[PDB]
Amino acid sequence: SHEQREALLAVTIPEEKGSALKFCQLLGGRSVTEFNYRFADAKNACIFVGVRLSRGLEERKEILQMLNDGGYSVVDLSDDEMAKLHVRYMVGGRPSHPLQERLYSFEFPESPGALLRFLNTLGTYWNISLFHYRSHGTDYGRVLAAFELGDHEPDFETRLNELGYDCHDETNNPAFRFFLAG
Amino acid sequence: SHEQREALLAVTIPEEKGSALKFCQLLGGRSVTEFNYRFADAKNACIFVGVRLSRGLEERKEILQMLNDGGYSVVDLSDDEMAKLHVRYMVGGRPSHPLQERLYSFEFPESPGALLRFLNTLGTYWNISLFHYRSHGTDYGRVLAAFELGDHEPDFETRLNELGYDCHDETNNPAFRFFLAG
Ligand SMILES: CC[C@H](C)[C@H](N)C(=O)O
Numbered sequence: 001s002h003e004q005r006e007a008l009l010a011v012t013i014p015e016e017k018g019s020a021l022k023f024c025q026l027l028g029g030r031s032v033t034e035f036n037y038r039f040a041d042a043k044n045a046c047i048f049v050g051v052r053l054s055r056g057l058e059e060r061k062e063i064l065q066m067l068n069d070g071g072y073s074v075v076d077l078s079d080d081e082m083a084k085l086h087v088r089y090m091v092g093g094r095p096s097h098p099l100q101e102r103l104y105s106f107e108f109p110e111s112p113g114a115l116l117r118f119l120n121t122l123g124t125y126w127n128i129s130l131f132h133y134r135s136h137g138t139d140y141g142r143v144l145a146a147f148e149l150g151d152h153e154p155d156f157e158t159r160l161n162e163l164g165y166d167c168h169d170e171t172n173n174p175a176f177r178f179f180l181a182g
Numbered sequence: 183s184h185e186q187r188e189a190l191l192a193v194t195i196p197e198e199k200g201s202a203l204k205f206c207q208l209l210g211g212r213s214v215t216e217f218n219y220r221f222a223d224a225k226n227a228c229i230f231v232g233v234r235l236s237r238g239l240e241e242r243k244e245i246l247q248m249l250n251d252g253g254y255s256v257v258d259l260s261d262d263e264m265a266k267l268h269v270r271y272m273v274g275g276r277p278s279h280p281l282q283e284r285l286y287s288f289e290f291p292e293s294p295g296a297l298l299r300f301l302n303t304l305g306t307y308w309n310i311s312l313f314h315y316r317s318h319g320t321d322y323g324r325v326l327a328a329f330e331l332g333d334h335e336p337d338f339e340t341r342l343n344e345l346g347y348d349c350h351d352e353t354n355n356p357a358f359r360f361f362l363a364g
C-alpha cells in the first residue's frame with residue numbers, strides 16, 4: 001500500500017535569497033502543509049516539504065514529475081516510516097558558519113497557495129535562514145522563520161502587521177538560543 | 183497562567199557515553215514523554231526533555247529544583263510558546279565533526295520510568311549521537327536513536343530483540359541521509 005493523504009518530499013534548493021519563493025511558485029496553488037528548513041550548507045539548502053493530496057498516489061507522482069521537470073532534486077519520503085514518525089520533527093541544527101539572525105513568528109490564513117502568498121509577501125530582500133511550519137488543519141498556519149540581518153534590520157514586524165499577517169519578534173527566545181542559534 | 187500538564191526542559195548534559203542514562207536516573211520513576219537530541223558540540227550536549235505532570239506547576243518546580251541540586255543546567259521552557267509550537271520539533275542538524283553512525287528504531291512499553299529502563303537496557307558501551315522520542319499516549323513509545331560505531335558494530339538488533347524491545351536497523355534511511363547524516 002501507499003500513503004494517499006499527503007506527499008512528503010526532501011528537496012534540494014539553492015541556498016540564496018528568494019529560493020524558497022521560487023520553489024513554492026512551482027508548487028503553485030496547492031495546499032503546502034509543511035515546510036521545514038534550517039541553514040546548514042552554504043550552497044544547497046535541504047527542505048522538508050509536505051503537500052496535502054486529494055488524488056493520492058497519482059497526485060504525488062504528478063508533483064514529483066513537475067518538480068523534476070522544473071530542475072529540482074527531490075526524494076520521495078511519502079512512504080518512509082522514519083520520515084513520517086521522526087525526521088519531519090528533526091529539521092534544525094546550528095548553521096555551518098555563524099549567522100546574525102532575527103527570528104519572528106507569523107500567522108497566515110490557510111487555503112491553497114497560502115504559503116506561496118506568504119513567502120511572496122515577506123519578499124526576498126533578506127535571506128531566510130530558518131523556517132518551520134506544519135499545518136494543524138486550522139484556519140491559520142503558524143510559521144517560525146529567521147532571517148539573516150544583512151545590511152538593514154528586517155522590517156517584518158512593522159510591514160507584515162500592516163499587511164494583515166500577524167508577526168512578532170522572537171529573536172531573544174530561549175529555546176532558539178539554546179538549540180538553534182549559532 | 184502556567185502550563186500544568188507537562189514540564190518542558192532544555193538541559194545541558196556531558197557529551198560522553200552514559201550521560202543520558204545518568205540524567206534519566208535522576209529523573210527516576212517519572213513519565214518522561216519527550217527526549218530529543220542530536221550530537222552537536224563535542225563537550226556539552228543539549229537535550230529537550232518533556233515530563234508529564236500530575237501536580238502541575240509545583241511538580242514542575244520540584245523537577246527543576248531536583249535537577250539543579252543534581253548539578254545540571256536546565257532552562258524551563260514549559261511556558262515558552264515557541265518551544266511548545268516549534269522548537270520541540272526542530273532538534274536535529276548535522277554533527278560538528280563527521281560521525282560514523284548506526285541508526286535504529288525501537289519500541290518500549292510506556293509507563294513511569296520506561297525511558298530510563300530502556301536507556302539502561304541499551305547500555306552505555308556505544309555513544310548515543312541522535313535521539314528522538316515523543317510519547318503519543320499509546321501503549322508503546324517509539325524511539326529513533328543513532329550510535330557512533332566506535333570499535334565494534336553495535337549489537338542492538340540482536341540483543342534488544344532478545345530482551346523484548348523491538349529494534350530495527352535504519353542506517354540507510356533516506357530521510358536520515360538527507361537531513362541528519364554528516
Ligand atoms: C528555505 C530558505 C531558502 C533556502 C533561502 N535561504 C531563501 O531565503 O529563500
Ligand SMILES: CC[C@H](C)[C@H](N)C(=O)O
Nearest residue numbers: 199200201202227309310
Ligand atoms: C543524549 C546522549 C548523550 C549526550 C550521550 N552521548 C550518551 O550516549 O549518553
